[PDB]
Amino acid sequence: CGLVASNLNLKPGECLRVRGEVAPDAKSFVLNLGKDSNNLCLHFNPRFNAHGDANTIVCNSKDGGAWGTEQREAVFPFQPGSVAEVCITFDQANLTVKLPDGYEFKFPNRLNLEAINYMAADGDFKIKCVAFD
Amino acid sequence: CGLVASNLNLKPGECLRVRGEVAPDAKSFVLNLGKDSNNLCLHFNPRFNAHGDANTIVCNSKDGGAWGTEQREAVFPFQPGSVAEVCITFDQANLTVKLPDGYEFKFPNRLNLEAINYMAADGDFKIKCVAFD
Numbered sequence: 359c360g361l362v363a364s365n366l367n368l369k370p371g372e373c374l375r376v377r378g379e380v381a382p383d384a385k386s387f388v389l390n391l392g393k394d395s396n397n398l399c400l401h402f403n404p405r406f407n408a409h410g411d412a413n414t415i416v417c418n419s420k421d422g423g424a425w426g427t428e429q430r431e432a433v434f435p436f437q438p439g440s441v442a443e444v445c446i447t448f449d450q451a452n453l454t455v456k457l458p459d460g461y462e463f464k465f466p467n468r469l470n471l472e473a474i475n476y477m478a479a480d481g482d483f484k485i486k487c488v489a490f491d
Numbered sequence: 492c493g494l495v496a497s498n499l500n501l502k503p504g505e506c507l508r509v510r511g512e513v514a515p516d517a518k519s520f521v522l523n524l525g526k527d528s529n530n531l532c533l534h535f536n537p538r539f540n541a542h543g544d545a546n547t548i549v550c551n552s553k554d555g556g557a558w559g560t561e562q563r564e565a566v567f568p569f570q571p572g573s574v575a576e577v578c579i580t581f582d583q584a585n586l587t588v589k590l591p592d593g594y595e596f597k598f599p600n601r602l603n604l605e606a607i608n609y610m611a612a613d614g615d616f617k618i619k620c621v622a623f624d
């Protein structure tokens with residue numbers, strides 16, 4: 359599928375920066391973060407037009423292989439056929455997803471993991487560089 | 492095991508840039524490139540103080556879990572307690588490895604892979620940035 363990375367050992371307060379390019383005719387791309395594939399503290403899925411959603415960011419969690427309750431945001435700062443950088447961090451309370459443009463999204467830390475060791479991109483999103491700063 | 496990456500889909504003539512921090516007391520580190528843990532087109536192992544070797548870059552291949560013929564490099568452009576970057580590309584003849592001070596050596600591609608989809612880092616070398624030019 360798309361890029362998968364393990365043993366990131368990302369601790370709270372630390373910054374995970376991902377730069378990638380969006381497909382010209384993109385429907386949906388996702389960035390998954392957590393312990394492994396079945397334990398996602400952050401399912402970041404901007405939907406241009408997929409699953410009945412149009413220009414909407416759908417965030418969710420997964421614990422023990424089971425999806426949590428979807429959270430949906432108002433603004434949709436992503437554009438098809440472009441480069442998008444995302445900076446990700448987390449506390450004991452929230453996952454924080456920042457964009458350079460000034461957009462900042464938050465998602466509740468439902469899994470309360472000690473660290474982020476997993477990252478995947480199952481969508482129309484070709485990762486070009488990943489920084490662990 | 493350290494940072495492991497899958498589904499890289501690196502085609503011939505495309506660059507893989509890895510920037511990281513060499514530990515102050517670094518003994519050795521490893522960069523594994525190929526299809527999986529059993530199939531490596533490049534085993535890149537700079538040995539500062541490991542296996543009786545000192546300041547020697549050890550290169551090898553792994554095919555079907557079987558190590559190929561080991562090749563060592565004369566020069567050693569790595570200093571412990573510093574930041575080093577490695578740029579790796581290939582064709583179906585050679586792996587090209589570029590080192591932090593302009594040094595450049597080739598390693599035979601003895602697996603003839605259609606693409607590199609697996610990277611595994613280990614040892615005294617914390618990754619900071621992985622790019623895919």
Ligand SMILES: CO[C@@H]1O[C@H](CO)[C@@H](O)[C@H](O[C@@H]2O[C@H](CO)[C@H](O)[C@H](OS(=O)(=O)O)[C@H]2O)[C@H]1NC(C)=O
Nearest residue numbers: 388401403409410411416417418425426427428480
């Ligand atoms: C009731 O079915 C579900 O409806 C919601 C509301 O539109 C859909 O969001 C949901 O689609 C799936 O959402 C999850 C995240 O909650 C994933 O993004 C999944 O994509 S993927 O991981 O397979 O790529 C969406 O298909 C939909 N279906 C399910 C299975 O919950």
